[PDB]
């Protein structure tokens, strides 16, 4: 034990002699193979921010995005493999519009992340498919204000401040040290990477109590907050 | 290795090897480039003919997937005809339901999901082909989208797919595509195809070219014969 | 679509070795303790939660099924939420058929069959949870325990998860039948204290009770009140 | 998909079905359960596997399952497989009582369940059920009966037999002492605890370690009852007495 | 569903599961039926006698009013095949307004054993069959089927464990002098099974609606042949 | 319209049926047997809409014979009558069977049993029963003279009075009548009553 | 290896190849060779016939598909007969709906669509057959070649075992074929197949089959007696 | 393990080759085409005198004008001959004439390579039919002989040997054959070559033979009719 394996328990989602699921453990490494980091935090009025990697310069930067609009009031940031990320965004859009059509009101944030987690659980049980290696959710609740939710490939999921990707643990430790609104996010992202980014390098989305719509900021607005940081 | 017999199995370091082996199968096949410009999209494909017994028109790598959308492919071409028929059915269903021509962003993200749907299951294999989509309309401008067999789709100013992708991408990067007319873009496209060509291995090839833009009022058409032949002439005299 | 063959197969000594691996997956989970008192049932569990950033009101481990039936688990979280959704679906099909709150033995006899099907169906692994199901009907409290095999027992006091054997010995010591519900909570917190490893709060345990009044989770103020003198 | 296929439903190099034999070896560790056919009834005598702890004892039986008004059964093997099959047996017996408006003959239920257990050993690619079931029941055709079933789908009629732990040694004791056509209920209850006193190696016999249930006919109605705590308590001391008089 | 191929060809023309199905035949109980000209007498061996047994439920020997049969191998497969044959026989009685011939149900059982040697995900049956019966014209019949699905008619035979030696015995002993009467046919049956073996026996006479023995008679026959095989 | 009559005695049941098959002004069979043998102790009398009768009767008959093959013993008349009732009741379906039925049976333990059944499959056990428009003319005589302890000669005499009432008053030509009796010795065929 | 990548069509080998697809082309590289070619007016097929035993007569290597299309086989014969019934059904559905025979260029793309689908799904095998398809429609005569689901438009083409010499002969003489008449056209293909034979065997009335379709001549298989004028001829080897 | 649809590096399906290996264990069949009809002879290979020889049938009636020989695993030829008979009776039902033998052999050889484990209409075939057949009959084209194998590849014949002793009997059938041979002479030489290859001793009890004529129907020989030609030995 602690490193035992019998047969095909390294090739499909069956139990090890210890009680671990190895493919679901290996699915977290696919998030780090993406080579990215995102930061999300909420205040009393929630924000997500992630890097933009643009290496080729043949890319149309209007189409490279890791911030997605789920419905009018809920947005999300993905992290990991790109096609699986677009798959779970399609699935979250379909479950949110399905909830609205069945039940007559806009879907809660926690009832979206519980639904995506109950979808993602099925691939860690049936043997014939692989788990999707890729999501942080933000939206304004009613009796709770801003919400931050994080689902993972194992199917778990609620947060005040979090991070995902390659610098998950260090930015998590930084936010743990600090918490004991956008400026906290952009300092947390700039600290662990030590890049001190350009406005073409990060994208920020805000959801507010004044504007409950998910809103994706323009370049000059992120440049204004970067230069507000730059004078400290 | 034991971890690469199935697309439904992660390796211990977090890689899916059947997809990353299919992206080696893409860069076995010949060069296809596409350049988006100010007012339209131009496609260019190095079409090998393996034996001169073969008629003209065999093994076309430029497909029409809607009347305003074209497509250029690379890789195992038998899969590429299947993805051409998926894109044709998807654009047909969008015209039938919603009453107008399908936006290229939505078409790329339907066909990217159909490509991605095979990189999850042990009961299928991932497609062995990458492909591009180009379109033009008065309301949307010109757009160029590229899909690799992992399912990943982005919008491009200029792209090169196939076995000579990097030497072609550095050469497309040298150009000012953003401000030129398409009749001035075909000459570069034809330049770069003959530049990156391997002449000592896998001889006897043909040039295949098509554009979509304002000069064809959004209809996707092949390049006419004299324009293609004078592009071949300009590129051969540039080749020395 | 799905495979059609089993992955849970008989070893030469006659053991379904996948079930005996899933029970080790249960044994590594968060500790959970349920005691049947004289006037009701207590359920209490350790929340294995640190890195304070976690908003503790977003997830509940003690999740009710009907107005007097609840659950708790030890093992894998998302399988437990699968069983909560299936158990609520079965209890409401019972309420559609008979117009009655489901007897607590009947919810166990249906949820245990649902856990059984995955040790024999095609291409699925067994569940990784052992449940504790409490219920009050016919003026009498019930406590059950289900397994990943699908076998189920009836207990008066039991423990599951990490250090469950010493938890069972500690519940062997303190238990007598006449114990009231508040004394059952007071023994349950002392039982979870045995392997908590550091400074229990109102945020890192979750206690639910069932009585004549129904099933309810205790608010953090009430569990913080009970942690006084504990 | 062919790397992972376990092939539970194929033959051996010798013509054996290994999962059926491994199921039988799983039964070989199960609880000792015997049943004795007498003149005026049948009993079942078992080992309780809820070997005591803080257990609750909420049901009237652990391993005895009423199947209809006229039959009962015991199980031994996996508990969870046994719950599924004894859920199935009730549906079979009530489909018959639905269709013909008379209670089912005792052999039809056993051959139906052995058809179901035989089907999973041949095709479908599942694992087979690892349970033995002892079958008691009364009907108007042959009266009090007994059966024994296995995972392979076999069945036979018996007047005394035993399954579970140390089953062959228990039937070895059962051969020498059975009085064919002369056994009453009282002598059978004496005889069953006589064997169970010598097949149980753990914690020499106490109040529980057993369920004992008799099937009798009373005023034209079939009565199946499990003996309560006082009556089992008496039968066992009150007959270590008979073992003390043996010198 | 489950649709792998279980029975596949080996490198030299041997359906492995058909060989192993005949292995499952080879460890079953040995059975004989011997045809006289106005009777057919069946003899099957017992397994593990167990004097606590209720003999009524362990009988190995009526598909219709006119036809019974013998088997060897896995007992549940045999009971399955009998329950297939009985419903086919009564459907035949439904459609033709005549009782069955023995060839119709023997061909049906012979094809039933082959269809499960070629279907997806089904293993072969592990049983052989010897079938008896009486036709409308009074012609007595004994056939054989085996797990490959090949079927033949026979005068007397044996299937199962040690069936080769019992077939050697019946080849030498099958004379008109051995089967004049019903009694000497029954004698010959117990003589042929007593080479290895305690046996069950039943008799089927013309329009007589099969009657089973009565081991008191069998004990007389086995003592009468046993003292002869001692002297 | 076809005629049925059955009388249940102390240890016997006496049934009779008309022996006519008609086709819209003419009769096409004058030796028509409406009694189908189910087993050794049970007959089912079958009349009604043509085609439905024989198909339903033979479908029940092969399942009764099949039960005897699977089990080695016969259905009780209660079990076979409830089986026939269940199969006729499963009516609201795409296959309605407009059949009118009498079942007569003898059991070892319960004795003689007679069951009445209409096309609704309403099952009613009766000491005597009859179908057809001819039933309306002879259930009155059966109410007049039947006692529970009628011996079988008074039963054939009362049956002869009933069939003479069919001859005198009933408008359809019903000249020849087949009769059978069931008791502990199996089925017995009796002599045809003719006019 | 060799061994765990040759067992499924749905496994990419790490060079970017599929070994079960390339092994299916060995089934067309072993078969009895066949030669196809066309003029501006005619399309002709020339095929060796495999008769199994000298008393067994000759395997049909040219199959009727409609009045206007015939095909040739090289490899797994029953897969080609499956594909013949497919093409029969497609031309009949086009006649039943649109009342004109389906164009050959669309029909061979439908075959390329049909053979592609088992080359991707688990548990299936590629069709182990290569075809030469000879047809006549509005666009004139056609010679096509189809295992790996590709399909080729050809001026003159030869598939099968030892076919490289026949392809070199057709590369030598394809510049004549457009203006040859019907008689010379089949003679070139007879010499092209005669390149493929061993040195001792000759083209006889029994082991060479011919199919011919033209502007007003419906498709016909030329066998034992019908091959004799086209055999004579002939420039000796 | 590997699939039933796995290509070898030679381009042959493994199961298709191994069914041809199961051909070479069967009872050897001899069928010869003449202008007066076709004669077919198969050896019964009686294994025990307790066996009834008449109940073994390895030459079958297909219709009033078509015979058929078989070799190998006769239980496969059960479903093949029954589908052949259903096809001939459907042709009589539909077209009110006799079905020609070529279309019959094409219909039967379609059932070869209708096998596989993924398309799987409910419980159809999982392995190739390991039986090779000889179809002899008469139609409007006259007397004909066809040959079929587990590859589903069907072809015309003038005479053919299938099975375990197929090899030398094919060369001997090359020896005796000429197109002007009569039916009775073909019966004679077919029993000559069968008696050359039989391990057992030939009489009317261990062979079957039948003829089909343009004049008369398919006629299975009785024991005395077998004995009459067998007296010539």
PDB file of N, CA and C in Angstrom, chain A residues 126-153:
ATOM      1  N   UNK A 126     -18.060   5.398 -14.822  1.00  0.00           N
ATOM      2  CA  UNK A 126     -18.111   4.548 -15.995  1.00  0.00           C
ATOM      3  C   UNK A 126     -16.721   4.414 -16.586  1.00  0.00           C
ATOM      4  N   UNK A 127     -16.394   3.207 -17.038  1.00  0.00           N
ATOM      5  CA  UNK A 127     -15.027   2.885 -17.415  1.00  0.00           C
ATOM      6  C   UNK A 127     -14.668   3.296 -18.832  1.00  0.00           C
ATOM      7  N   UNK A 128     -15.647   3.579 -19.685  1.00  0.00           N
ATOM      8  CA  UNK A 128     -15.407   3.712 -21.115  1.00  0.00           C
ATOM      9  C   UNK A 128     -15.008   5.107 -21.562  1.00  0.00           C
ATOM     10  N   UNK A 129     -14.990   6.096 -20.676  1.00  0.00           N
ATOM     11  CA  UNK A 129     -14.614   7.448 -21.049  1.00  0.00           C
ATOM     12  C   UNK A 129     -13.636   7.998 -20.030  1.00  0.00           C
ATOM     13  N   UNK A 130     -12.968   9.101 -20.400  1.00  0.00           N
ATOM     14  CA  UNK A 130     -11.980   9.709 -19.524  1.00  0.00           C
ATOM     15  C   UNK A 130     -12.547  10.959 -18.876  1.00  0.00           C
ATOM     16  N   UNK A 131     -12.102  11.331 -17.680  1.00  0.00           N
ATOM     17  CA  UNK A 131     -12.644  12.532 -17.050  1.00  0.00           C
ATOM     18  C   UNK A 131     -12.101  13.780 -17.715  1.00  0.00           C
ATOM     19  N   UNK A 132     -12.939  14.804 -17.794  1.00  0.00           N
ATOM     20  CA  UNK A 132     -12.509  16.048 -18.408  1.00  0.00           C
ATOM     21  C   UNK A 132     -11.528  16.745 -17.486  1.00  0.00           C
ATOM     22  N   UNK A 133     -10.334  17.019 -17.990  1.00  0.00           N
ATOM     23  CA  UNK A 133      -9.341  17.720 -17.208  1.00  0.00           C
ATOM     24  C   UNK A 133      -9.416  19.219 -17.368  1.00  0.00           C
ATOM     25  N   UNK A 134     -10.456  19.833 -16.822  1.00  0.00           N
ATOM     26  CA  UNK A 134     -10.585  21.278 -16.860  1.00  0.00           C
ATOM     27  C   UNK A 134     -11.376  21.778 -15.662  1.00  0.00           C
ATOM     28  N   UNK A 135     -12.879  24.668 -13.451  1.00  0.00           N
ATOM     29  CA  UNK A 135     -13.834  25.738 -13.712  1.00  0.00           C
ATOM     30  C   UNK A 135     -14.199  26.500 -12.464  1.00  0.00           C
ATOM     31  N   UNK A 136     -14.081  27.822 -12.514  1.00  0.00           N
ATOM     32  CA  UNK A 136     -14.405  28.702 -11.401  1.00  0.00           C
ATOM     33  C   UNK A 136     -15.587  29.561 -11.811  1.00  0.00           C
ATOM     34  N   UNK A 137     -16.596  29.662 -10.956  1.00  0.00           N
ATOM     35  CA  UNK A 137     -17.842  30.336 -11.298  1.00  0.00           C
ATOM     36  C   UNK A 137     -18.049  31.569 -10.431  1.00  0.00           C
ATOM     37  N   UNK A 138     -18.638  32.621 -11.010  1.00  0.00           N
ATOM     38  CA  UNK A 138     -18.971  33.840 -10.274  1.00  0.00           C
ATOM     39  C   UNK A 138     -20.355  34.331 -10.676  1.00  0.00           C
ATOM     40  N   UNK A 139     -21.081  34.871  -9.708  1.00  0.00           N
ATOM     41  CA  UNK A 139     -22.400  35.419  -9.948  1.00  0.00           C
ATOM     42  C   UNK A 139     -22.944  36.020  -8.673  1.00  0.00           C
ATOM     43  N   UNK A 140     -23.963  36.857  -8.829  1.00  0.00           N
ATOM     44  CA  UNK A 140     -24.585  37.536  -7.698  1.00  0.00           C
ATOM     45  C   UNK A 140     -25.801  36.741  -7.259  1.00  0.00           C
ATOM     46  N   UNK A 141     -25.752  36.230  -6.035  1.00  0.00           N
ATOM     47  CA  UNK A 141     -26.880  35.529  -5.453  1.00  0.00           C
ATOM     48  C   UNK A 141     -27.796  36.551  -4.774  1.00  0.00           C
ATOM     49  N   UNK A 142     -28.958  36.098  -4.302  1.00  0.00           N
ATOM     50  CA  UNK A 142     -29.982  36.941  -3.671  1.00  0.00           C
ATOM     51  C   UNK A 142     -30.338  36.339  -2.312  1.00  0.00           C
ATOM     52  N   UNK A 143     -29.828  36.979  -1.242  1.00  0.00           N
ATOM     53  CA  UNK A 143     -29.485  36.600   0.141  1.00  0.00           C
ATOM     54  C   UNK A 143     -28.023  36.231   0.355  1.00  0.00           C
ATOM     55  N   UNK A 144     -27.186  36.188  -0.675  1.00  0.00           N
ATOM     56  CA  UNK A 144     -25.774  35.942  -0.400  1.00  0.00           C
ATOM     57  C   UNK A 144     -24.806  36.868  -1.116  1.00  0.00           C
ATOM     58  N   UNK A 145     -25.257  37.648  -2.090  1.00  0.00           N
ATOM     59  CA  UNK A 145     -24.370  38.559  -2.764  1.00  0.00           C
ATOM     60  C   UNK A 145     -23.490  37.829  -3.751  1.00  0.00           C
ATOM     61  N   UNK A 146     -22.215  38.193  -3.793  1.00  0.00           N
ATOM     62  CA  UNK A 146     -21.288  37.519  -4.705  1.00  0.00           C
ATOM     63  C   UNK A 146     -20.995  36.097  -4.267  1.00  0.00           C
ATOM     64  N   UNK A 147     -20.862  35.211  -5.252  1.00  0.00           N
ATOM     65  CA  UNK A 147     -20.532  33.814  -5.020  1.00  0.00           C
ATOM     66  C   UNK A 147     -19.315  33.419  -5.837  1.00  0.00           C
ATOM     67  N   UNK A 148     -18.462  32.588  -5.251  1.00  0.00           N
ATOM     68  CA  UNK A 148     -17.338  31.987  -5.954  1.00  0.00           C
ATOM     69  C   UNK A 148     -17.398  30.487  -5.726  1.00  0.00           C
ATOM     70  N   UNK A 149     -17.405  29.722  -6.810  1.00  0.00           N
ATOM     71  CA  UNK A 149     -17.533  28.277  -6.772  1.00  0.00           C
ATOM     72  C   UNK A 149     -16.455  27.677  -7.650  1.00  0.00           C
ATOM     73  N   UNK A 150     -15.877  26.561  -7.224  1.00  0.00           N
ATOM     74  CA  UNK A 150     -14.842  25.900  -8.005  1.00  0.00           C
ATOM     75  C   UNK A 150     -15.121  24.411  -8.061  1.00  0.00           C
ATOM     76  N   UNK A 151     -15.374  23.891  -9.256  1.00  0.00           N
ATOM     77  CA  UNK A 151     -15.479  22.458  -9.474  1.00  0.00           C
ATOM     78  C   UNK A 151     -14.200  21.937 -10.112  1.00  0.00           C
ATOM     79  N   UNK A 152     -13.910  20.666  -9.888  1.00  0.00           N
ATOM     80  CA  UNK A 152     -12.678  20.028 -10.327  1.00  0.00           C
ATOM     81  C   UNK A 152     -13.029  18.719 -11.012  1.00  0.00           C
ATOM     82  N   UNK A 153     -12.076  18.085 -11.718  1.00  0.00           N
ATOM     83  CA  UNK A 153     -12.390  16.826 -12.421  1.00  0.00           C
ATOM     84  C   UNK A 153     -12.837  15.664 -11.558  1.00  0.00           C
TER      85      UNK A 153
END
